[PDB]
Write an enzyme that holds these catalytic residues in place. Structure first.
Site, PDB file in Angstrom:
ATOM      1  N   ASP A 143       0.067  -1.427  -0.210  1.00  0.00           N
ATOM      2  CA  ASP A 143      -0.592  -0.328   0.045  1.00  0.00           C
ATOM      3  C   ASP A 143       0.842   1.374   0.213  1.00  0.00           C
ATOM      4  O   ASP A 143       1.510   1.890   0.830  1.00  0.00           O
ATOM      5  CB  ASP A 143      -0.865   0.410   0.978  1.00  0.00           C
ATOM      6  CG  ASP A 143      -2.004   0.840   1.353  1.00  0.00           C
ATOM      7  OD1 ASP A 143      -1.909   2.043  -0.190  1.00  0.00           O
ATOM      8  OD2 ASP A 143      -2.642   0.604   2.056  1.00  0.00           O
ATOM      9  N   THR A 144       0.973   1.670  -0.868  1.00  0.00           N
ATOM     10  CA  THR A 144       1.634   3.446  -1.189  1.00  0.00           C
ATOM     11  C   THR A 144       0.763   4.234  -0.599  1.00  0.00           C
ATOM     12  O   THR A 144       1.982   5.115  -0.617  1.00  0.00           O
ATOM     13  CB  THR A 144       2.080   3.235  -3.046  1.00  0.00           C
ATOM     14  OG1 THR A 144       1.123   3.704  -3.646  1.00  0.00           O
ATOM     15  CG2 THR A 144       3.076   2.805  -3.645  1.00  0.00           C
ATOM     16  N   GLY A 145      -0.121   4.142   0.001  1.00  0.00           N
ATOM     17  CA  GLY A 145      -1.290   5.470   0.194  1.00  0.00           C
ATOM     18  C   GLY A 145      -1.044   5.482   1.922  1.00  0.00           C
ATOM     19  O   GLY A 145      -1.847   6.519   2.347  1.00  0.00           O
TER      20      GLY A 145
END
Ligand SMILES: Cc1c(O)cccc1C(=O)N[C@@H](Cc1ccccc1)[C@H](O)C(=O)N1CSC(C)(C)[C@H]1C(=O)NC(C)(C)C
Lengths: 99, 99
Positions: free
Chosen positions: B25-27
């Site tokens: 998850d880059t967010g």
């Protein structure tokens, strides 16, 4: 391009004639944008993540410009704390995770 | 490797000798995992998601393996829809976004 993850991967996007800062988010199935006006019809939807769910409006076939790449897809509008570009649009610009 | 985003970027991780499924998850700035037992003392931590802020337990210097890549860092334990591998660990495994 190649974006490192030392800090939040924020990018400028153009949507509905407006410019906004958004998070390139691989964890998000959908693209969620803060309250704004969009053309076309819409239908209610509930989405959930950390902290629970929020109700948003689903607009389809919405065009967005991301770092020079024009992508079309569904966009959810609602009370999100941050604008997030989800997988439904990240695929269209050919964005991938690499390591 | 190169991971496309047509489907959720789910991978197999290993923590405390156990295998689990997680989302790259880059967010997420942090790594958040579902309730489980971890060694050592923990500190309080508030994280903000799509539905608001929640309280989680912060354990530091935790050994965790992501798709074969070894990492050692902060892992947060709390109520989460998915086990999410955030930026703090994605950087340790040299994961970047590319398009
Ligand atoms: C876990 C975390 C931290 O430790 C620190 C900062 C932000 C997040 C976080 O929840 N980030 C979120 C995105 C976001 C940041 C700020 C405000 C709102 C949303 C995310 O990477 C994601 O897509 N997640 C996390 S949980 C999920 C896997 C279901 C998915 C999700 O919420 N997806 C929808 C937006 C589609 C609901």
């Amino acid at each position: 391009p190649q974006i490192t993850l030392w800090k939040r991967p924020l990018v400028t996007i153009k949507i509905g004639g407006q410019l906004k800062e958004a998070l390139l988010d691989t964890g998000a199935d959908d693209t969620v944008i803060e309250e704004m006006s969009l053309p076309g019809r819409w239908k209610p939807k509930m989405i959930g993540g950390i902290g629970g769910f929020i109700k948003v409006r689903q607009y389809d076939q919405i065009i967005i410009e991301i770092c020079g790449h024009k992508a079309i897809g569904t966009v959810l509008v609602g009370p999100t704390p941050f604008n997030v570009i989800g997988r439904n649009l990240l695929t269209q610009i050919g964005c991938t995770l690499n390591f």
